[PDB]
Ligand binder design. Structure first.
Ligand SMILES: Nc1ncnc2c1ncn2[C@@H]1O[C@H](COP(=O)(O)OP(=O)(O)OP(=O)(O)O)[C@@H](O)[C@H]1O
Ligand SMILES: Nc1ncnc2c1ncn2[C@@H]1O[C@H](COP(=O)(O)OP(=O)(O)OP(=O)(O)O)[C@@H](O)[C@H]1O
Ligand SMILES: Nc1ncnc2c1ncn2[C@@H]1O[C@H](COP(=O)(O)OP(=O)(O)O)[C@@H](O)[C@H]1O
Ligand SMILES: [Mg+2]
Ligand SMILES: [Mg+2]
Ligand SMILES: [Mg+2]
Lengths: 41, 278, 49, 51, 48, 292, 340, 96
C-alpha cells in the first residue's frame, strides 16, 4: 500500500518545483518522507 | 414567468464589513499546514493545466481535525480574509429545522448558489452534529437527519470537476464520523493539527508578545524550555493574564514576576508522580 | 468477482444502508431476501483490530 | 387506458376533482442504486496484480 | 372527537382541544344535560 | 341599541391564542388626503402581535375590547375567528395531569390513631403548622421559619401514615405526588410538570406538597463516558432549583419521605432545601402493646 | 369592531421598483408589490414587515421581535442584596469584578498595555457555599442588562427548538450592547459527548456544540460577558473548558475559622438576644460546616425558645443547636471535586 | 414480568398505572403476576447506573398498593422460584 503512496506523493514534489516530468531524486525524497512518517506509530 | 436566481441561508459574506481580517502573520509556526491548504485550495484555481498534464487527480474535499485549542478556525479566518473568490460559511447544526423538508432544501440551494455564483468555497464548521455513525429509525428526528446526510452526499458527488467549487469542513472529534463521508472521491485530503512541541512555542511567544511593552529584561527562554505540553490557546492566556496582573497595581510595564505568577496560574499540575513505583 | 461476473456486495453492519434493506432489521438474514433477485453474488467482509 | 400498461411503482398524472387517471410519467425509483452508490466499491480486474 | 380541558363558572363556557387544530371556546347543545360533562374526558363536537 | 349591537357580535366560538409582543407606535412623517389610511399614520397608542393556535402570526393594528394595560407577553386570550380581533382574557392554564394531583375528598383520621411516635409528631407540627397560624411569634424574635422536612426510616413504620393524618387535620391546599410520576418519555416533558406543580401551588396562600418515594429521582450523579441516564438527572436539577435558588419563595411547604438515605445526592440534602431531617425507630417494647 | 389584522412576514429581496419577494413565517413564499409612501430605501433584505391579507401588499415595516421567553428572562429578580451580606470571601469578589465591570468602564487602560480583557469565568465549589448568592449580589449593584437562565428550562421536545432559543438570546444580547448572560446549573447541558449515546440524547449534543459555536465561532463578541456556575465540575466537556471560552476558574471553599466568625455575625444580627454571647466557642465547634448551615444554627436556636415561651434567646440554646446540627451531617458525602 | 420491560424510558410505569386503572374500572377482580424476580430484586446502585429503569418500575408497582387511598377491591397473587432476591419493601405485610 505504501508504493501507491510514494507514487502519489512523488508528483507533488515536481508540482512544487514547477516542472513537467518527475526525476529520480524526487522519488527518493518521497521514499524517505514515507519512511519517516511511518517511523511514528 | 421565470426568476433570476434567488436563494436564502447565509447570503454571501458581503466582503465590506465582514472580513475578520487576520493576517498570515498573526498565525505563527504552522507553515506546513499553511502551505498545504494553500496548494489544496488556491493553487488548483490557476495551475489546473499542470494537473491535467502530469495526471495527479486534483483533490476536491478537505477535512481538518485535531485536539481543541490549536487554531483550526483561525485558518478559515485567514483564508476568508485573503481570498479573492467568493466565500461562504455556515454552522453545522443550522440545517435542522422544525418544518418538514426545510433541511434538504436549505442544503440544495446552498450548493446551487455556490455553483452559479463564482469559483466559491463553502465552509462548514463542526460537522459532528450531522454526520455520525449510529441511528435509530423510529424517532423521526433521526429520519430528518438521515435525509439531510443522504442528499448532501448525493449532491457533493454530482459535480463535474469543471465548476471550481471547493469544500472546507472542520471537526472536533474525528472518531464518531461515518466513513461513508470520507470515501475517496468526496473528501480526498485529511489534515491533522497537532500541539506545539519546541519549535512552535518560541515562535508563538515571539509573535504574541510583540504588542506588549514587556519591560526590557524579561527572559523567555526560561519558559520555552520547560516541559508541560500545553496547547496553543494557553500561550495567549498566559500573556493576557500577566498583562492584567500588571494593570491591577497601576504599573503600565510588565515585569518578570508577572510572568512567573501568570504561568503558575495557568498551568495547575500538582504532581501526579507517585514515586515508589519508580 | 469481476472476472466471473457476480454482483460483488460487501456488508459492514452500518445504518445508512440498513433502511434500504428493511424497515428496522430486527434479524440479520433479510439480505438473502434481497440477494436472491440477483443470485450470482459474492458476500465479502473485513475485520480491523 | 389498459390496466396492463399500469405498472407498479410508476408516476402518473391525475385529474383534480374526480381524481381519475389521465396520463403516464417515465421516472421510477429503486433501492439498489442508492445502496451501491452509498458504498462505492472499486471495480478492477487482473491487470493490476503484482506478485 | 376532542378532549376537554376545563370549564368556568355561572355560565357554561368550555375549552375544547382537538388533535391538530386549535383550542376553542364552545358551549353545549340543547339535547345534552350539563351535569355529565365532568372535566377532562373525550367528547364529540360537530364540524361547523 | 349600541350595547346590543356589541352583544350580538360576540358569538362564543372564539379561537384561542397567545400574545407575543406589545409595541409602541408613532405616525409617519408625511400625510395625505383623498387617500389616507386610518391605520398607518393616525395611530398613537399601543399595538399587539399575537400567535394563533393554528400557527399563524398576526399583527393587530387595534387591540379591541380589552384594555392594553392588563396584558403582558405570554398571556392567553380568546380571539374572534374572522377578524382576529381580541375579545376576552381567559384564566391561565395548568396541565391536565397536575390538576389531578390535588386532594379534594379529605382523608379522615385523628392524631390519636398513631402509637409510639410522640416526639416526631411534635417535630413535624411545630415546623409546618405554626409558621402558618402564628407568624407574629416568629416575627417578634427576628427569625426565619424552618423550610421543609425529610422523614426517613425502615419500611414498616409510620412514615406515610403521618402525612395522611397531617392532610386530614390541616386546612391548607394539599398536593399529593409520587417520585416515578415525574419521569416522562419525551425529552423535557418532566420539568414542565415540576414547574407547573409549583406554579399552581403558589397561587393559593398556604400550601403543602408531599413528594413520596423521592429515591426514584434523587439518585447520585456520576461520571460516565460511554452511556448513562442523563435524563432524570436533568429533571432533578430542575427540582433542586425550584426549591431554593433565584427568586426565593415562601408560601409552599415541602415534605419528603424515603426509606433509603445513603443513595441520595448530597446536593439534595443541603441545609437549605431539606431543613429538618427526622427519622423513625423500630417500635420499642412498649409501643407494640399500643399498636395492637 | 370594523378592523382586521394583518399577516406578518419577512422580506428576502427587492426585485424591481415594485416587485418584492417575501417569505411568510408560516410557509409559502410570495411575490408582492409595495405601497407608494413607505420609503422603499428602508426595506433592506431581512427586515420584518406586515402584509395586507386581502391582496398581499407591503403596508408597514417593524422592529425585531423578542420571543416571550427572552423577555421573561430579561428582568425577574429580587435583586436586592448588598455586598454587605456576603462575608468571608471578599477576595473572590475582587477577582471577579476585575473582569465583569472594570473593563466596561475604563477601557482606556488595557489598550495602553496591549491586551484584550477576558470574556467569561466560572465558579465552582461544594454545595451550600454561596455560588448563587454572589451572582444575585452582582445583579443588584451594577447597571447593565442582565439575562438570568437556569439551563434546564430551555429544553423542549420538538426538533430544533433548543438551538433556536440559544441563537435568539445571543442576538438579543448583541442588540443591547452592555449585557451579561448568567447561565446557572450548567452541568445539566455541558455533559460530555457520548461515544454511544441514544437517540433521545443527541439533541443535547447538537445544542451544546451550537452554543460553543456562538461563544467563539468565526465571529466576535464585543461588550458581552458571561459567567457560569456549577456544583461539580468534573463531568464537563473538554472543549467547553478550553481557555478561549471560559478564561478564569474561581474556587469557593469551606470557610476558615475566621470566616466562620465573619459569617455567623450576620445571621445572628436581628435576633432578640442578650449581651453575653461568646461567638468564639460556637466557632470552636463548627469544624467543616458550610455557610448554609450557620443560618440553620441561628434558626434552631430560636426554635428552642418558641417553646418554653421565652421571647429572648440566651447563650445555652446556641450550644444546643450547634450540637444538634453537628450530628445530622453524618450522611453527606464530603467529596470536594475538581475541574480537569 | 418480562412483559413489563419496554423500549423507552418511563414506559413500564405507565403500563402499571393503566393496568391498575383498568382493574379499578370494573367492580373487583384478581391480578396474577408471574416470574416476579425479573422485575425487582433490590436497590444496589453503584458506579454507573444499573437496572435503574427496572427499579423505577418496581417502585411504581409498590406505590400502587400503598399510601393515600389504596386500591380497595383488588386482590393480587404472585409466584416465584428463588424468592431470596425479593426486596424487603415488597415483602412487607400490607402487600403480601
Ligand atoms: N499559531 C497559533 N497556533 C495555535 N493557536 C494560536 C496561534 N496563534 C494564536 N493562537 C490562539 O489559539 C486560539 C485558536 O482559536 P480557535 O477558536 O480557532 O481554536 P480551535 O483550535 O479552532 O478551536 P475550536 O475547535 O474549539 O474552535 C486563539 O485563541 C488564538 O489566540
Ligand atoms: N459567605 C456567606 N455569607 C452569608 N451567607 C452565606 C454565605 N455563603 C453562603 N451563605 C448562605 O447560603 C445560602 C444559600 O446559598 P446559595 O443559594 O448561594 O447556594 P450555593 O451555595 O451556590 O449552592 P447550591 O446552589 O449548589 O445548592 C443563603 O441562605 C446564605 O445565607
Ligand atoms: N402506630 C403505628 N405506627 C406505625 N405504623 C402503623 C401504626 N398503626 C398502623 N400502622 C400501619 O403502618 C402502615 C403504614 O405504611 P408505611 O410503612 O408508613 O408506608 P411506608 O413503608 O411507605 O412508610 C399502615 O398499614 C398502618 O396500618
Ligand atoms: Mg473553532
Ligand atoms: Mg410510603
Ligand atoms: Mg445555585
Amino acid at each position: 500500500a505504501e508504493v501507491k503512496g510514494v507514487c502519489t506523493e512523488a508528483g507533488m514534489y515536481a508540482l512544487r518545483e514547477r516542472r513537467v516530468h518527475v526525476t529520480q531524486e524526487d522519488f527518493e525524497m518521497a521514499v524517505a518522507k514515507v519512511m519517516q512518517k511511518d517511523s511514528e506509530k | 414567468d421565470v426568476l433570476p436566481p434567488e436563494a436564502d441561508s447565509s447570503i454571501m459574506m458581503l466582503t465590506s464589513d465582514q472580513k475578520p481580517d487576520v493576517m498570515y502573520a498573526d498565525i505563527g509556526g504552522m507553515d506546513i499546514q499553511k502551505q498545504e491548504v494553500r496548494e489544496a485550495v488556491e493553487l488548483p484555481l490557476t495551475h489546473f493545466e499542470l494537473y491535467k498534464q502530469i495526471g495527479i487527480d486534483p483533490p476536491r474535499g478537505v477535512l481538518m481535525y485535531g485536539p481543541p485549542g490549536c487554531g483550526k478556525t483561525m485558518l478559515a479566518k485567514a483564508v476568508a480574509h485573503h481570498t479573492t473568490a467568493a466565500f461562504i460559511r455556515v454552522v453545522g447544526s443550522e440545517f435542522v429545522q422544525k418544518y418538514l423538508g426545510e433541511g434538504p432544501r436549505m442544503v440544495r440551494d446552498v450548493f446551487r448558489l455556490a455553483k452559479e455564483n463564482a469559483p466559491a468555497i463553502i465552509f462548514i464548521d463542526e460537522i459532528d452534529a450531522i454526520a455520525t455513525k449510529r441511528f435509530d429509525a423510529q424517532t423521526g428526528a433521526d429520519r430528518e437527519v438521515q435525509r439531510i446526510l443522504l442528499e448532501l452526499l448525493n449532491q457533493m458527488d454530482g459535480f463535474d470537476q469543471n465548476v471550481n467549487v471547493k469544500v472546507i469542513m472542520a471537526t472536533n472529534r474525528a472518531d464518531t464520523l461515518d466513513p461513508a463521508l470520507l470515501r475517496p472521491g468526496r473528501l480526498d485530503r485529511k489534515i491533522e493539527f497537532p500541539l506545539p512541541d519546541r519549535r512552535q512555542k518560541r515562535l508563538i511567544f515571539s509573535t504574541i508578545t510583540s504588542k506588549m511593552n514587556l519591560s526590557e529584561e524579561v527572559d523567555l527562554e526560561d519558559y520555552v524550555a520547560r516541559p508541560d505540553k500545553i496547547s496553543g490557546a494557553d500561550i495567549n492566556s498566559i500573556c493576557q493574564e500577566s498583562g492584567m496582573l500588571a494593570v491591577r497595581e497601576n504599573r503600565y510595564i510588565v515585569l518578570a514576576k508577572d510572568f512567573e505568577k501568570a504561568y503558575k496560574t495557568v498551568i495547575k499540575k500538582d504532581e501526579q508522580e507517585h514515586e515508589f513505583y519508580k | 468477482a469481476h472476472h466471473t461476473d457476480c454482483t460483488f456486495i460487501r456488508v459492514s453492519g452500518s445504518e445508512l444502508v440498513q433502511k434500504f434493506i428493511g424497515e428496522g432489521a430486527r434479524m440479520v438474514r433479510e439480505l438473502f431476501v434481497m440477494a436472491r433477485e440477483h443470485a450470482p453474488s459474492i458476500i465479502f467482509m473485513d475485520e480491523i483490530d | 387506458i389498459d390496466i396492463n400498461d399500469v405498472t407498479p411503482n410508476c408516476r402518473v398524472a391525475l385529474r383534480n376533482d374526480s381524481y381519475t387517471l389521465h396520463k403516464i410519467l417515465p421516472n421510477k425509483v429503486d433501492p439498489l442504486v442508492s445502496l451501491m452508490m452509498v458504498e462505492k466499491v472499486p471495480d478492477s480486474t487482473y491487470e493490476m496484480i503484482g506478485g | 372527537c376532542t378532549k376537554i380541558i376545563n370549564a368556568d363558572s355561572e355560565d357554561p363556557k368550555y375549552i375544547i382541544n382537538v388533535k391538530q387544530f386549535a383550542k376553542f371556546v364552545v358551549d353545549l347543545s340543547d339535547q345534552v344535560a350539563p351535569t355529565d360533562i365532568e372535566e377532562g374526558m373525550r367528547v364529540g363536537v360537530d364540524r361547523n | 341599541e349600541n350595547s346590543e349591537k356589541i352583544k350580538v357580535n360576540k358569538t362564543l366560538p372564539y379561537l384561542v391564542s397567545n400574545v407575543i409582543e406589545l409595541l409602541d407606535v408613532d405616525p409617519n412623517d408625511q400625510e395625505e388626503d383623498g387617500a389616507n389610511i386610518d391605520l398607518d399614520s393616525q395611530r398613537k397608542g399601543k399595538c399587539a402581535v399575537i400567535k394563533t393556535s393554528t400557527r399563524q402570526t398576526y399583527f393587530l393594528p387595534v387591540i379591541g375590547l380589552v384594555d392594553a394595560e392588563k396584558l403582558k407577553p405570554g398571556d392567553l386570550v380568546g380571539v374572534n375567528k374572522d377578524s382576529y380581533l381580541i375579545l376576552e382574557t381567559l384564566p391561565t392554564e395548568y396541565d391536565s395531569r397536575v390538576k389531578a394531583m390535588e386532594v379534594d375528598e379529605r382523608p379522615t383520621e385523628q392524631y390519636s390513631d398513631i402509637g409510639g411516635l410522640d416526639k416526631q409528631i411534635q417535630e413535624l407540627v411545630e415546623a409546618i403548622v405554626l409558621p402558618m397560624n402564628h407568624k407574629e411569634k416568629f416575627e417578634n424574635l427576628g427569625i426565619q421559619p424552618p423550610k421543609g422536612v425529610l422523614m426517613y426510616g425502615p419500611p414498616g413504620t409510620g412514615k406515610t401514615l403521618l402525612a395522611r393524618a397531617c392532610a386530614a387535620q390541616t386546612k391548607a391546599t394539599f398536593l399529593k405526588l409520587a417520585g416515578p410520576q415525574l419521569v416522562q418519555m419525551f425529552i423535557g416533558d418532566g420539568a414542565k410538570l415540576v414547574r407547573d406543580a409549583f406554579a399552581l401551588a403558589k397561587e393559593k396562600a398556604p400550601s403543602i406538597i408531599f413528594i413520596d418515594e423521592l429515591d426514584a429521582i434523587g439518585t447520585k450523579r456520576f461520571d460516565s463516558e460511554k452511556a448513562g441516564d442523563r435524563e432524570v438527572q436533568r429533571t432533578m436539577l430542575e427540582l433542586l432549583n425550584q426549591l431554593d435558588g433565584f427568586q426565593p419563595n415562601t408560601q409552599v411547604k415541602v415534605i419528603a419521605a424515603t426509606n433509603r438515605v445513603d443513595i441520595l445526592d448530597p446536593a439534595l440534602l443541603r441545609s437549605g432545601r431539606l431543613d429538618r431531617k427526622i427519622e423513625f425507630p423500630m417500635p420499642n417494647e412498649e409501643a407494640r402493646a399500643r399498636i395492637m | 369592531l370594523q378592523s382586521v389584522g394583518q399577516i406578518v412576514g419577512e422580506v428576502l429581496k427587492q426585485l424591481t421598483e415594485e416587485k418584492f419577494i417575501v417569505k411568510a413565517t408560516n410557509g409559502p413564499r410570495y411575490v408582492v408589490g409595495c405601497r407608494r409612501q413607505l420609503d422603499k430605501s428602508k426595506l433592506k433584505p431581512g427586515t420584518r414587515v406586515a402584509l395586507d391579507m386581502t391582496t398581499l401588499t407591503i403596508m408597514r415595516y417593524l422592529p425585531r421581535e423578542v420571543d416571550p421567553l427572552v423577555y421573561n428572562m430579561s428582568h425577574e429578580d429580587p435583586g436586592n442584596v448588598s455586598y454587605s451580606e456576603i462575608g468571608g470571601l471578599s477576595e473572590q469578589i475582587r477577582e471577579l469584578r476585575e473582569v465583569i465591570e472594570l473593563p466596561l468602564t475604563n477601557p482606556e487602560l488595557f489598550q495602553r498595555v496591549g491586551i484584550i480583557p477576558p470574556k467569561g469565568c466560572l465558579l465552582y465549589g461544594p454545595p451550600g457555599t454561596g455560588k448563587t448568592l454572589l451572582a444575585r449580589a452582582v445583579a443588584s449593584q451594577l447597571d447593565c442588562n442582565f439575562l438570568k437562565v437556569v439551563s434546564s428550562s430551555i429544553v423542549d421536545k420538538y426538533i430544533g427548538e433548543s438551538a433556536r432559543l440559544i441563537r435568539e438570546m445571543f442576538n438579543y444580547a448583541r442588540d443591547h450592547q452592555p449585557c451579561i448572560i448568567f447561565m446557572d446549573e450548567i452541568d445539566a447541558i455541558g455533559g460530555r459527548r457520548f461515544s454511544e449515546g441514544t437517540s433521545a440524547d443527541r439533541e443535547i449534543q447538537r445544542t451544546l456544540m451550537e452554543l460553543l459555536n456562538q461563544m467563539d465561532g468565526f465571529d466576535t463578541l464585543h461588550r458581552v460577558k458571561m459567567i457560569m456556575a456549577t456544583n461539580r465540575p468534573d463531568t464537563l466537556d473538554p472543549a467547553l473548558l478550553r481557555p478561549g471560552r471560559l478564561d478564569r476558574k474561581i474556587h469557593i471553599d469551606l470557610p476558615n475559622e475566621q470566616a466562620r466568625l465573619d459569617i455567623l455575625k450576620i445571621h445572628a444580627g436581628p435576633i432578640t438576644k442578650h449581651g453575653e454571647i461568646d461567638y468564639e466557642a460556637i466557632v470552636k465547634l463548627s469544624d467543616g460546616f458550610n455557610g448554609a448551615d450557620l443560618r440553620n444554627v441561628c434558626t434552631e436556636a430560636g426554635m428552642f425558645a418558641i417553646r418554653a415561651d421565652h421571647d429572648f434567646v440566651v447563650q445555652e440554646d446556641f450550644m444546643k443547636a450547634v450540637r444538634k446540627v453537628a450530628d445530622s451531617k453524618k450522611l453527606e458525602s464530603k467529596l470536594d471535586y475538581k475541574p480537569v | 414480568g418480562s412483559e413489563l420491560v419496554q423500549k423507552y424510558v418511563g414506559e413500564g410505569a405507565r403500563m402499571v398505572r393503566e393496568l391498575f386503572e383498568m382493574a379499578r374500572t370494573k367492580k373487583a377482580c384478581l391480578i396474577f403476576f408471574d416470574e416476579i424476580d425479573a422485575i425487582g430484586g433490590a436497590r444496589f446502585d453503584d458506579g454507573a447506573g444499573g437496572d435503574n429503569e427496572v427499579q423505577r418500575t418496581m417502585l411504581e408497582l409498590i406505590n400502587q398498593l400503598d399510601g393515600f387511598d389504596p386500591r380497595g377491591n383488588i386482590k393480587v397473587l404472585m409466584a416465584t422460584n428463588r424468592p431470596d432476591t425479593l426486596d424487603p419493601a415488597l415483602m412487607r405485610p400490607g402487600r403480601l
